[PDB]
Symmetry: D2
Subunit: 200 residues, 4 copies
């Protein structure tokens, strides 16, 4: 099946004033769309190389699958772990199980957020900040992935895109304000489901 761009589960302006409509449109229709197109071409290229038994080609195309495939995976998860304040955005208590696990690990929900913010701001270059679990209702950990590498060896609970294109038009260089503002639109209900499922 040819991969396609998953529609957003809300209007492009539903996350304002935390994430502008302009960013949402470009981020989804341009960047994410590009990763989808790139993934399709890459797999097609890998397919031909495999059929031709061209090892050099198969290995070279590997980076493309990883970059575009990881981009597709990451953004698909990103769109879903966000929501407007009217649809549960920022409603941490709509995730009782995950919230209880978070407080046990970091002491409190707010302490967890400061640690997460710190991690996002510590990412050098393009990357993502993630809250992950080692299984259904498992132990929680904060991790980061570079460029468009996806979370592996664990199940993603929620992610925050730290590529500059995810916030520059609005927050400019002030990524600290983007990080602190995105908390208002985190779809915790979706995070609750991912944590309980603990599906890597």
């Amino acid at each position: 099946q040819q991969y396609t761009l998953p529609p957003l589960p809300y209007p492009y302006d539903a996350l304002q004033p935390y994430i502008s409509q302009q960013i949402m449109e470009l981020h989804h229709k341009k960047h994410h769309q590009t990763y989808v197109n790139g993934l399709n071409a890459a797999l097609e290229a890998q397919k031909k190389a495999a059929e031709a038994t061209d090892v050099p080609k198969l290995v070279s195309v590997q980076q493309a699958i990883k970059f575009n495939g990881g981009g597709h995976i990451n953004h698909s998860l990103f769109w879903k772990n966000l929501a407007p304040e009217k649809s549960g955005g920022g409603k941490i208590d709509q995730a009782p199980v995950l919230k209880a696990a978070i407080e046990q690990r970091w002491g409190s929900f707010d302490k967890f957020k400061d640690a997460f913010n710190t991690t996002l701001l510590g990412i050098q270059g393009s990357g993502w900040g993630w809250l992950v679990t080692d299984g259904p209702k498992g132990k929680l950990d904060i991790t980061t992935t570079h460029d468009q590498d996806p979370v592996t060896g664990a199940a993603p609970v929620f992610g925050v895109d730290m590529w500059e294109h995810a916030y520059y038009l609005q927050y400019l260089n002030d990524k600290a304000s983007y990080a602190k503002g995105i908390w208002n639109v985190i779809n915790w209900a979706e995070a609750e489901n991912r944590y309980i499922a603990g599906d890597k």
Copy 2:
């Protein structure tokens, strides 16, 4: 202590190819940050060394590389850029380098194609560079990721492909960015670096 080097031209001197807004942020915010992070990083490696704390010494390594590289790349960037009415985009002001580029790629135009292709090929944050292996040596196009600086070769000129270098003006259209920056490339500076070939 390291400091932020002033730009060699007004913040709007590169328009309409690079907006005044980007230059101010890119210089006063981004480059400044690498400068601050570098000083703070070297400070740590110092005390860490005098304390015989290898774990801490190695831990600061990344910060020194990221911020130090950040300081190096941007400092070179500002200098290999120039307004049109001041030599910007004037390839003929680099006789020796131009000739070498024509010999390597067949023509200046073919070199540009190769460079643009390379710039647009960068995944994530990085830089595109033209380098030489020595004074008036062999030319090559390379890239570095994040803020890693060119090593093992002498930088002739670089183009910042980090999103913050063009997003405000070109948005996601990095192709238009690569296309437009050729108009403000300071070839006179590239020429000096090439002839000097200072690794």
Copy 3:
């Protein structure tokens, strides 16, 4: 203070037949010594470059500091988390607190060993396998570092060197038998102290 090669806490053949005298001698007197020499040379070059306010040189030397500094750290810890069978080597009961924590995290000591061996055998190229903790008697985790990168952002409990020079003379390509045999000389007494201390 110039860095020097730390003496082994036991004879060169005290670890046989799990690790030959020959390997220990070369691994210690040669490999580790090389990192020590490289570490001193790197820090000296970094100092001169710093004094000369030479950013390029400062940046370039970081790889040597990282590589050699890491090598010194990793092997220094390695010699200490190993011990003759008659001196507590392979005696997990000498690590009551650690063993308990290990049993709670992985269910049992054997299950932990399986997970560790799997991680060790999964390393591509040169690297290390580690059991770390986030703090004194904190949460345990299995991780790996590539080449000579040291454990950072966590406290090392014990590590296993998977570079080929650590086993090739005796096990040749059979790194699986090397992984299995080393558990016999693991100094759990040392791992206990490191875990209880939990010093990052």
Copy 4:
């Protein structure tokens, strides 16, 4: 279905520069392992692609890179080696390449010293390569980490610097290994690759 290519000479034909024991293990064990690894990774890749499993598709990309790169590298390696009687070390059997090397490094011997230095400078597992940008093009010495294959250039000849390539015979003395392998470099083959200049 990928298979292990036979050697173009007996297992002891490269002595005393590379022992028979090394050749047998390196070829029959190590190289074979990458072949098997490549075959398995490719099958897992096809199954994931047909199941629309992007996460699984991305994950196996590293195995294709590592094993496929290992297969490519070793296959190139056996062919750019040869017994003294079969053209081993006969640099003048590569007129064009040699002229290019002398023009670049001043002399063939200066080239060898620079290459040895690059080889000894490799950190961890890796390879040393002499490459060209195209047919009878510009020469350059580079290195690749672990089993990464040469990309963006055409491999003229490579020297394996993984410890398994020399430890049994040279132990930690990689310098003597580098200096001895020049005697068995198949320059006739190098000449052909340089003239062809086929990237990959």
